Design a binder for these strands. Structure first.
Lengths: 188, 191
DNA sequence: TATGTCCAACTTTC
DNA sequence: GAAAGTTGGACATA
DNA sequence: TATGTCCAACTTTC
DNA sequence: GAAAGTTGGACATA
Protein backbone atom coordinates (compact mmCIF):
# COMPACT_ATOMS: atom_id res chain seq x y z
CA UNK A 1 0.00 0.00 0.00
CA UNK A 2 1.20 3.52 -0.84
CA UNK A 3 1.88 4.76 2.67
CA UNK A 4 4.89 6.54 1.16
CA UNK A 5 2.92 9.79 0.89
CA UNK A 6 2.45 9.86 4.67
CA UNK A 7 6.14 9.08 5.17
CA UNK A 8 7.04 11.79 2.65
CA UNK A 9 5.07 14.35 4.67
CA UNK A 10 6.48 13.03 7.95
CA UNK A 11 10.06 13.25 6.69
CA UNK A 12 9.36 16.80 5.53
CA UNK A 13 8.18 17.61 9.06
CA UNK A 14 11.31 16.02 10.54
CA UNK A 15 13.55 18.14 8.33
CA UNK A 16 11.60 21.34 9.02
CA UNK A 17 11.73 20.50 12.73
CA UNK A 18 15.52 20.13 12.73
CA UNK A 19 16.02 23.25 10.59
CA UNK A 20 13.44 25.74 11.90
CA UNK A 21 12.14 24.21 15.14
CA UNK A 22 8.53 23.99 16.26
CA UNK A 23 7.90 27.57 15.11
CA UNK A 24 8.54 26.60 11.49
CA UNK A 25 6.35 23.48 11.55
CA UNK A 26 3.30 24.94 9.84
CA UNK A 27 1.11 23.05 7.39
CA UNK A 28 2.35 25.31 4.58
CA UNK A 29 6.05 24.86 5.36
CA UNK A 30 5.76 21.08 5.75
CA UNK A 31 3.64 20.79 2.60
CA UNK A 32 6.25 22.78 0.65
CA UNK A 33 9.14 20.70 1.99
CA UNK A 34 7.19 17.56 1.04
CA UNK A 35 6.13 18.91 -2.36
CA UNK A 36 2.41 18.25 -1.84
CA UNK A 37 -0.77 20.27 -1.51
CA UNK A 38 -1.65 21.57 1.95
CA UNK A 39 -4.85 19.51 1.92
CA UNK A 40 -2.88 16.25 1.82
CA UNK A 41 -1.29 17.00 5.21
CA UNK A 42 -4.66 16.86 6.97
CA UNK A 43 -5.59 13.90 4.76
CA UNK A 44 -2.77 11.88 6.37
CA UNK A 45 -2.78 13.41 9.88
CA UNK A 46 -5.60 14.27 12.27
CA UNK A 47 -4.20 17.74 12.98
CA UNK A 48 -1.00 19.77 12.94
CA UNK A 49 -0.57 19.04 16.64
CA UNK A 50 -0.47 15.31 15.92
CA UNK A 51 2.02 15.85 13.09
CA UNK A 52 4.30 18.09 15.17
CA UNK A 53 4.12 15.59 18.04
CA UNK A 54 4.78 12.49 15.91
CA UNK A 55 7.48 14.24 13.87
CA UNK A 56 9.18 15.40 17.07
CA UNK A 57 9.23 11.82 18.36
CA UNK A 58 10.65 10.61 15.04
CA UNK A 59 13.47 13.17 15.34
CA UNK A 60 14.27 12.09 18.90
CA UNK A 61 14.35 8.46 17.77
CA UNK A 62 16.76 9.39 14.97
CA UNK A 63 18.91 11.18 17.57
CA UNK A 64 19.10 8.02 19.66
CA UNK A 65 19.95 6.02 16.54
CA UNK A 66 22.87 8.39 15.92
CA UNK A 67 24.00 8.02 19.53
CA UNK A 68 23.85 4.22 19.39
CA UNK A 69 25.87 3.88 16.18
CA UNK A 70 28.84 5.11 18.21
CA UNK A 71 30.40 1.96 19.66
CA UNK A 72 32.39 2.19 22.88
CA UNK A 73 34.87 -0.02 24.72
CA UNK A 74 32.92 -0.70 27.91
CA UNK A 75 29.58 -0.18 29.59
CA UNK A 76 30.90 2.85 31.48
CA UNK A 77 31.62 4.61 28.19
CA UNK A 78 28.31 3.51 26.64
CA UNK A 79 26.44 5.02 29.59
CA UNK A 80 28.31 8.32 29.27
CA UNK A 81 27.49 8.35 25.55
CA UNK A 82 23.81 7.66 26.21
CA UNK A 83 23.66 10.48 28.79
CA UNK A 84 26.11 13.06 27.44
CA UNK A 85 27.60 12.13 24.07
CA UNK A 86 29.89 14.82 22.69
CA UNK A 87 29.02 13.92 19.08
CA UNK A 88 28.39 17.19 17.25
CA UNK A 89 25.81 15.57 14.97
CA UNK A 90 23.40 15.50 17.94
CA UNK A 91 23.41 19.30 18.42
CA UNK A 92 20.40 20.01 16.14
CA UNK A 93 18.41 17.24 17.85
CA UNK A 94 19.28 18.46 21.35
CA UNK A 95 18.20 21.97 20.32
CA UNK A 96 14.75 20.71 19.30
CA UNK A 97 14.71 18.66 22.51
CA UNK A 98 15.23 21.80 24.61
CA UNK A 99 12.49 23.65 22.73
CA UNK A 100 10.03 20.84 23.44
CA UNK A 101 10.87 21.07 27.15
CA UNK A 102 9.93 24.76 27.16
CA UNK A 103 6.81 24.36 25.02
CA UNK A 104 5.71 21.48 27.27
CA UNK A 105 4.75 24.04 29.92
CA UNK A 106 2.08 25.56 27.64
CA UNK A 107 1.31 22.81 25.09
CA UNK A 108 -0.19 19.57 26.47
CA UNK A 109 0.46 17.65 23.24
CA UNK A 110 4.16 18.55 23.23
CA UNK A 111 4.25 17.81 26.96
CA UNK A 112 2.96 14.29 26.31
CA UNK A 113 5.50 13.77 23.52
CA UNK A 114 8.27 15.24 25.68
CA UNK A 115 7.33 12.92 28.55
CA UNK A 116 7.64 9.92 26.22
CA UNK A 117 11.16 10.92 25.15
CA UNK A 118 12.19 11.10 28.82
CA UNK A 119 10.91 7.54 29.25
CA UNK A 120 12.71 6.42 26.09
CA UNK A 121 15.86 8.06 27.45
CA UNK A 122 15.33 6.49 30.88
CA UNK A 123 14.77 3.05 29.33
CA UNK A 124 18.03 3.38 27.40
CA UNK A 125 19.99 4.23 30.55
CA UNK A 126 18.25 1.42 32.45
CA UNK A 127 19.22 -1.12 29.79
CA UNK A 128 22.87 -0.02 29.89
CA UNK A 129 23.05 -0.10 33.70
CA UNK A 130 21.48 -3.56 33.85
CA UNK A 131 23.90 -4.86 31.22
CA UNK A 132 26.97 -3.38 32.91
CA UNK A 133 25.78 -4.86 36.20
CA UNK A 134 25.43 -8.32 34.65
CA UNK A 135 28.89 -7.82 33.11
CA UNK A 136 30.36 -7.34 36.59
CA UNK A 137 31.48 -3.81 35.70
CA UNK A 138 28.78 -1.84 37.53
CA UNK A 139 28.14 -2.14 41.25
CA UNK A 140 24.53 -1.40 42.18
CA UNK A 141 23.61 -0.08 45.62
CA UNK A 142 20.23 0.99 44.21
CA UNK A 143 17.82 0.03 41.44
CA UNK A 144 18.83 0.79 37.86
CA UNK A 145 15.59 2.75 37.47
CA UNK A 146 16.45 5.00 40.43
CA UNK A 147 20.06 5.45 39.28
CA UNK A 148 18.92 6.34 35.77
CA UNK A 149 16.50 9.06 36.90
CA UNK A 150 19.21 10.73 38.99
CA UNK A 151 21.73 10.62 36.14
CA UNK A 152 19.15 12.03 33.72
CA UNK A 153 18.21 14.67 36.29
CA UNK A 154 21.90 15.51 36.67
CA UNK A 155 22.25 15.97 32.90
CA UNK A 156 19.09 18.06 32.52
CA UNK A 157 19.86 20.35 35.46
CA UNK A 158 23.48 20.76 34.40
CA UNK A 159 22.36 21.51 30.83
CA UNK A 160 19.90 24.09 32.13
CA UNK A 161 22.82 25.88 33.77
CA UNK A 162 25.13 25.34 30.78
CA UNK A 163 22.74 27.11 28.39
CA UNK A 164 22.59 30.14 30.70
CA UNK A 165 26.24 31.07 30.14
CA UNK A 166 28.06 29.86 33.25
CA UNK A 167 31.79 29.88 32.44
CA UNK A 168 32.25 27.52 35.40
CA UNK A 169 29.95 24.94 33.76
CA UNK A 170 31.15 24.50 30.17
CA UNK A 171 31.23 21.37 27.99
CA UNK A 172 34.44 20.30 29.74
CA UNK A 173 32.91 20.63 33.21
CA UNK A 174 29.76 18.88 32.00
CA UNK A 175 31.83 15.86 30.95
CA UNK A 176 33.80 15.78 34.21
CA UNK A 177 30.61 16.05 36.28
CA UNK A 178 28.85 13.26 34.37
CA UNK A 179 31.90 10.99 34.62
CA UNK A 180 32.12 11.74 38.34
CA UNK A 181 28.52 10.78 39.14
CA UNK A 182 28.81 7.57 37.10
CA UNK A 183 31.82 6.74 39.29
CA UNK A 184 29.81 7.33 42.47
CA UNK A 185 26.59 5.57 41.42
CA UNK A 186 28.12 2.50 39.76
CA UNK A 187 31.72 2.10 40.99
CA UNK A 188 31.43 2.15 44.79
CA UNK B 1 3.59 61.14 52.81
CA UNK B 2 6.83 62.19 51.19
CA UNK B 3 9.88 59.98 51.36
CA UNK B 4 13.47 60.24 50.20
CA UNK B 5 14.66 58.40 47.10
CA UNK B 6 15.90 55.28 48.90
CA UNK B 7 12.76 54.91 51.02
CA UNK B 8 10.40 55.52 48.09
CA UNK B 9 12.23 52.95 45.96
CA UNK B 10 11.93 50.34 48.71
CA UNK B 11 8.16 50.85 48.99
CA UNK B 12 7.85 50.24 45.25
CA UNK B 13 10.16 47.23 45.46
CA UNK B 14 8.27 45.76 48.42
CA UNK B 15 5.01 46.03 46.48
CA UNK B 16 6.63 44.45 43.42
CA UNK B 17 7.76 41.59 45.68
CA UNK B 18 4.28 40.87 47.07
CA UNK B 19 2.71 41.06 43.60
CA UNK B 20 5.28 38.59 42.26
CA UNK B 21 4.51 36.11 45.04
CA UNK B 22 0.73 36.61 44.83
CA UNK B 23 0.29 36.80 41.03
CA UNK B 24 3.59 35.89 39.35
CA UNK B 25 5.31 37.85 36.60
CA UNK B 26 2.03 38.26 34.71
CA UNK B 27 0.67 40.44 37.51
CA UNK B 28 3.76 42.64 37.74
CA UNK B 29 2.45 45.54 35.67
CA UNK B 30 3.43 49.13 36.41
CA UNK B 31 -0.07 50.14 37.51
CA UNK B 32 -0.70 47.00 39.58
CA UNK B 33 2.58 47.35 41.48
CA UNK B 34 2.19 51.11 41.93
CA UNK B 35 -1.35 50.69 43.27
CA UNK B 36 -0.15 47.96 45.63
CA UNK B 37 2.52 50.36 46.90
CA UNK B 38 -0.04 53.16 47.19
CA UNK B 39 1.87 55.48 44.85
CA UNK B 40 1.36 57.17 41.50
CA UNK B 41 2.14 54.99 38.50
CA UNK B 42 4.83 57.44 37.37
CA UNK B 43 6.79 56.73 40.56
CA UNK B 44 7.99 53.44 39.04
CA UNK B 45 10.00 55.10 36.27
CA UNK B 46 11.20 57.81 38.65
CA UNK B 47 13.08 55.04 40.50
CA UNK B 48 13.63 52.25 37.94
CA UNK B 49 15.01 52.41 34.41
CA UNK B 50 12.15 50.24 33.14
CA UNK B 51 9.60 47.64 34.16
CA UNK B 52 12.09 45.00 33.05
CA UNK B 53 14.61 46.25 35.59
CA UNK B 54 11.96 46.34 38.33
CA UNK B 55 10.73 42.81 37.59
CA UNK B 56 14.27 41.40 37.54
CA UNK B 57 15.43 43.14 40.73
CA UNK B 58 12.17 42.35 42.54
CA UNK B 59 12.48 38.72 41.43
CA UNK B 60 15.99 38.62 42.91
CA UNK B 61 14.68 40.07 46.18
CA UNK B 62 11.96 37.40 46.35
CA UNK B 63 14.53 34.63 45.89
CA UNK B 64 16.69 36.30 48.55
CA UNK B 65 13.73 36.34 50.93
CA UNK B 66 13.25 32.63 50.19
CA UNK B 67 16.90 31.96 51.03
CA UNK B 68 16.50 33.88 54.29
CA UNK B 69 13.55 31.70 55.28
CA UNK B 70 15.48 28.50 54.55
CA UNK B 71 18.68 29.64 56.26
CA UNK B 72 16.81 30.28 59.54
CA UNK B 73 15.38 26.74 59.63
CA UNK B 74 17.20 25.84 62.88
CA UNK B 75 18.68 22.55 61.73
CA UNK B 76 20.46 20.02 63.94
CA UNK B 77 23.47 19.42 61.69
CA UNK B 78 25.27 20.33 58.50
CA UNK B 79 23.60 17.46 56.63
CA UNK B 80 20.17 18.77 57.61
CA UNK B 81 21.31 22.31 56.76
CA UNK B 82 22.48 21.21 53.31
CA UNK B 83 19.26 19.29 52.65
CA UNK B 84 17.22 22.34 53.66
CA UNK B 85 19.18 24.59 51.29
CA UNK B 86 18.65 22.08 48.44
CA UNK B 87 15.26 20.43 48.97
CA UNK B 88 13.42 21.91 51.95
CA UNK B 89 9.87 20.57 52.12
CA UNK B 90 8.67 23.64 54.03
CA UNK B 91 5.34 24.63 52.49
CA UNK B 92 6.12 28.31 53.06
CA UNK B 93 8.71 28.17 50.25
CA UNK B 94 6.34 26.95 47.53
CA UNK B 95 5.16 30.44 46.43
CA UNK B 96 8.83 31.39 46.01
CA UNK B 97 9.63 28.20 44.09
CA UNK B 98 6.78 28.76 41.62
CA UNK B 99 8.15 32.22 40.82
CA UNK B 100 11.61 30.68 40.49
CA UNK B 101 10.36 28.11 37.97
CA UNK B 102 8.57 30.89 36.07
CA UNK B 103 11.81 32.89 35.80
CA UNK B 104 13.69 29.87 34.43
CA UNK B 105 11.32 29.76 31.45
CA UNK B 106 11.12 33.53 30.93
CA UNK B 107 14.93 33.65 30.88
CA UNK B 108 14.75 32.04 27.43
CA UNK B 109 13.13 35.21 26.01
CA UNK B 110 14.22 37.98 28.42
CA UNK B 111 17.93 38.81 28.91
CA UNK B 112 17.19 40.87 32.03
CA UNK B 113 15.39 37.95 33.67
CA UNK B 114 18.05 35.57 32.35
CA UNK B 115 20.81 37.62 33.98
CA UNK B 116 18.78 37.79 37.20
CA UNK B 117 18.11 34.05 37.12
CA UNK B 118 21.84 33.52 36.57
CA UNK B 119 22.55 35.48 39.76
CA UNK B 120 20.12 33.41 41.83
CA UNK B 121 21.96 30.27 40.70
CA UNK B 122 25.24 31.79 41.92
CA UNK B 123 23.65 32.87 45.20
CA UNK B 124 22.28 29.35 45.62
CA UNK B 125 25.68 27.89 44.76
CA UNK B 126 27.45 30.18 47.24
CA UNK B 127 25.23 28.96 50.09
CA UNK B 128 25.72 25.29 49.21
CA UNK B 129 29.50 25.77 49.06
CA UNK B 130 29.51 27.41 52.49
CA UNK B 131 27.50 24.58 54.06
CA UNK B 132 29.77 21.95 52.48
CA UNK B 133 32.92 23.74 53.66
CA UNK B 134 31.38 24.11 57.13
CA UNK B 135 30.42 20.44 57.36
CA UNK B 136 33.88 19.45 56.13
CA UNK B 137 35.62 21.56 58.78
CA UNK B 138 33.23 20.22 61.43
CA UNK B 139 34.22 16.65 60.52
CA UNK B 140 30.74 15.75 59.26
CA UNK B 141 31.30 15.75 55.48
CA UNK B 142 33.94 13.71 53.65
CA UNK B 143 35.09 15.52 50.50
CA UNK B 144 36.54 13.68 47.51
CA UNK B 145 36.11 16.82 45.37
CA UNK B 146 36.03 20.59 45.74
CA UNK B 147 32.97 22.05 47.44
CA UNK B 148 32.37 24.07 44.27
CA UNK B 149 32.10 20.97 42.08
CA UNK B 150 29.96 19.13 44.64
CA UNK B 151 27.65 22.13 44.93
CA UNK B 152 26.99 22.42 41.19
CA UNK B 153 26.17 18.71 40.93
CA UNK B 154 23.77 18.83 43.88
CA UNK B 155 22.05 21.94 42.51
CA UNK B 156 21.88 20.40 39.03
CA UNK B 157 20.32 17.23 40.47
CA UNK B 158 17.69 19.34 42.24
CA UNK B 159 16.91 21.43 39.15
CA UNK B 160 16.79 18.33 36.95
CA UNK B 161 14.55 16.35 39.29
CA UNK B 162 12.23 19.33 39.74
CA UNK B 163 11.80 19.52 35.97
CA UNK B 164 10.86 15.84 35.83
CA UNK B 165 8.70 16.15 38.95
CA UNK B 166 6.82 19.06 37.37
CA UNK B 167 6.02 16.92 34.31
CA UNK B 168 3.72 14.73 36.42
CA UNK B 169 5.99 11.67 36.24
CA UNK B 170 4.38 9.22 38.70
CA UNK B 171 7.69 7.45 39.37
CA UNK B 172 9.09 10.83 40.48
CA UNK B 173 6.79 12.32 43.12
CA UNK B 174 7.57 14.45 46.17
CA UNK B 175 8.59 11.38 48.19
CA UNK B 176 10.98 10.15 45.49
CA UNK B 177 12.47 13.65 45.19
CA UNK B 178 13.46 13.62 48.87
CA UNK B 179 14.89 10.09 48.68
CA UNK B 180 16.97 10.97 45.62
CA UNK B 181 18.36 14.13 47.22
CA UNK B 182 19.21 12.34 50.47
CA UNK B 183 20.91 9.60 48.46
CA UNK B 184 23.21 11.89 46.45
CA UNK B 185 24.16 13.78 49.62
CA UNK B 186 25.37 10.42 50.96
CA UNK B 187 27.40 9.67 47.82
CA UNK B 188 29.02 13.10 47.66
CA UNK B 189 29.73 13.83 51.33
CA UNK B 190 29.66 10.48 53.20
CA UNK B 191 31.51 8.07 50.88
C1' DT C 1 -7.43 47.32 20.34
C1' DA C 2 -5.94 45.50 15.83
C1' DT C 3 -2.92 43.31 13.27
C1' DG C 4 -0.14 39.16 11.60
C1' DT C 5 -0.31 34.33 11.60
C1' DC C 6 -2.31 29.94 11.25
C1' DC C 7 -5.76 25.90 10.76
C1' DA C 8 -9.84 22.79 10.86
C1' DA C 9 -14.09 22.94 8.72
C1' DC C 10 -16.65 24.18 4.85
C1' DT C 11 -17.61 24.78 -0.40
C1' DT C 12 -16.89 24.20 -5.11
C1' DT C 13 -15.12 21.71 -8.92
C1' DC C 14 -13.88 17.71 -11.36
C1' DG D 1 -16.20 10.67 -3.76
C1' DA D 2 -11.72 12.99 -3.88
C1' DA D 3 -9.02 16.99 -4.79
C1' DA D 4 -8.75 21.75 -4.97
C1' DG D 5 -10.19 25.94 -3.29
C1' DT D 6 -12.41 29.04 0.36
C1' DT D 7 -14.00 30.36 4.82
C1' DG D 8 -14.33 31.98 9.54
C1' DG D 9 -12.37 32.54 13.60
C1' DA D 10 -8.75 31.06 16.95
C1' DC D 11 -4.34 32.33 18.65
C1' DA D 12 -0.52 35.25 19.73
C1' DT D 13 1.39 39.73 19.30
C1' DA D 14 2.32 45.08 17.38
C1' DT E 1 -7.27 46.43 25.44
C1' DA E 2 -3.85 47.37 28.64
C1' DT E 3 0.53 47.98 29.20
C1' DG E 4 5.19 50.54 29.01
C1' DT E 5 7.11 54.93 28.72
C1' DC E 6 7.69 59.65 29.71
C1' DC E 7 6.70 64.57 31.41
C1' DA E 8 4.66 69.06 32.84
C1' DA E 9 2.11 70.54 36.61
C1' DC E 10 1.43 70.04 41.42
C1' DT E 11 2.67 69.39 46.52
C1' DT E 12 5.82 69.06 50.16
C1' DT E 13 10.24 69.95 52.20
C1' DC E 14 14.21 72.60 52.75
C1' DG F 1 12.06 80.77 46.53
C1' DA F 2 14.57 76.63 45.17
C1' DA F 3 14.91 71.72 45.74
C1' DA F 4 12.85 67.56 46.33
C1' DG F 5 9.21 64.63 45.80
C1' DT F 6 4.58 63.32 43.78
C1' DT F 7 0.71 63.20 40.63
C1' DG F 8 -2.30 62.02 36.82
C1' DG F 9 -2.45 61.62 32.27
C1' DA F 10 -0.69 61.86 27.26
C1' DC F 11 1.33 59.05 24.01
C1' DA F 12 3.03 54.95 21.97
C1' DT F 13 3.31 50.18 22.10
C1' DA F 14 3.16 44.37 23.56
Amino acid sequence: NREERRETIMQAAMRVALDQGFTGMTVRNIATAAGVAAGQVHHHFTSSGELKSQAFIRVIREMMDLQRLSRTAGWREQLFSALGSEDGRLEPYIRLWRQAQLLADSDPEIKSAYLLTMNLWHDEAVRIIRAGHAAGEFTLRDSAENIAWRLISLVCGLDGIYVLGMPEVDDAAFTRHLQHVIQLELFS
